[PDB]
């Protein structure tokens, strides 16, 4: 009797449908989800409660990206004896790997993608922008042909929430620079960074609560018709594509613009199954994290919930490129996709970051002052 912990915003009910193809061909055993909070963070504080308290209620665990170094060094996980990785991702084999022991099994890959308006940006004969300085003349050509109150220029992520750790990021890769073994903190970058989102809304070109808005708020407001540019993971498009959707047949998707000569990074993403430590079903759940990593669930949820793959075959896959096209040119996106800090105290890391990101864009303090206290606080962590 399974019990398996994934997000809300993971699409538990396409989770669901490959839980029913296990249980059809596996008799005697059932699975049932624990839906946990929408972003990463919130699930996190969660599961650092139950792991601490050896609680052995859940079994396998969907865990982000950045979990493996906490989880391997807290022992919450049972890892898979002499597991080879080698059928998956390069990024996503590294990431599952924690001092020589497979701490998970790949779920599914995810990056940032720039998602816009192709309908808009073809009715004004613009391109895509490589720049951020073309999508700020993009949003105000736009803005002011349209004369729609409710249209956004730029939907980014500037909630205290996992999601603004790569909000902060994508500027600093783009600049060339690296936050790490030890922290290279790179003032200029970072100011650079802190001030770019800041300058969205204070040009108008993001609206002026952006330090509310979650990934999923986004994804919503986008998929209402309300936004010209989103930053934003895979699964969008399914929401997008859908049938409770303002943008059918209405989106594009470009790689992140670069900051002034730079270059068009991204933020590493994608989940991987951990089995419990304290699962009293470690063998089922073992056999059951096999069939969910396994390449043809991999496929389902590409085809069924716009997850990006675990396997490089599955992204020029005949049936995924016919349902999704862009995942034909996604690979080389994901496998150059910047990791955030690969730590235990990455709980840390997160509040640090996610913390200045927010109060820099809700006015508690400037872009120079949130670089100060940042780099302050990561040199205490890392
Ligand atoms: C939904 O997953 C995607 O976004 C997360 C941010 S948040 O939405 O949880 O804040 C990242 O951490 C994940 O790596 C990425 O795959």
Redesign the pocket.
């Known amino acids: 009797e399974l019990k398996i912990f994934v997000?809300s915003?993971?699409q538990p009910d396409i989770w669901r449908k490959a839980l029913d193809q296990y249980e059809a061909k596996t008799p005697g055993v059932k699975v049932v989800i624990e839906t946990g909070g929408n972003?990463?963070?919130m699930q996190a504080q969660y599961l650092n409660t139950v792991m601490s308290a050896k609680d052995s209620s859940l079994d396998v665990l969907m865990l982000?990206?950045?979990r493996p170094a906490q989880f391997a060094t807290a022992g919450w996980t049972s890892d898979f004896s002499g597991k080879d990785l080698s059928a998956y991702l390069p990024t996503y084999a590294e990431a599952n790997t924690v001092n020589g022991k497979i701490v998970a099994l790949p779920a599914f890959a995810?990056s940032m993608f720039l998602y816009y308006r192709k309908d808009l940006l073809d009715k004004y004969g613009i391109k895509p922008p490589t720049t951020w300085d073309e999508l700020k003349e993009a949003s105000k050509k736009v803005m002011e042909g349209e004369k729609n109150p409710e249209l956004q220029g730029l939907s980014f992520?500037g909630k205290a929430?996992?999601?603004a750790v790569?909000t902060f990021l994508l500027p600093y890769w783009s600049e060339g620079k690296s936050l790490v073994g030890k922290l290279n903190f790179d003032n200029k970058a970072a100011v650079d960074s802190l001030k770019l989102w800041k300058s969205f809304v204070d040009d108008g070109i993001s609206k002026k609560n952006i330090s509310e808005v979650?990934?999923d708020d986004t994804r919503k407001e986008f998929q209402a018709g309300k936004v010209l540019f989103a930053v934003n993971?895979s699964?969008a498009w399914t929401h997008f594509q859908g049938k409770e959707s303002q943008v059918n047949d209405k989106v594009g998707v470009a790689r992140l613009p670069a900051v002034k000569g730079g270059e068009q990074t991204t933020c590493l993403?994608?989940?991987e199954f951990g089995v419990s430590a304290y699962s009293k079903q470690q063998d089922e759940a073992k056999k059951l994290v096999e069939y969910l990593s396994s390449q043809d669930v991999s496929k389902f949820m590409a085809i069924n919930a716009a997850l990006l793959p675990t396997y490089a075959a599955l992204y020029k896959d005949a049936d995924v490129t016919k349902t999704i096209p862009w995942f034909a040119d996604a690979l080389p996106v994901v496998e150059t996709a910047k990791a955030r800090p690969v730590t235990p105290r990455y709980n840390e890391v997160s509040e640090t970051i996610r913390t200045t990101v927010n109060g820099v864009l809700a006015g508690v303090m400037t872009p120079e002052d949130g670089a100060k206290q940042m780099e302050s606080r990561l040199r205490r962590v890392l």
């Open positions: 997000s915003q993971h972003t990463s963070e982000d990206v950045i995810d992520q929430i996992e999601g790569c979650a990934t993971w699964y993403g994608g989940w």
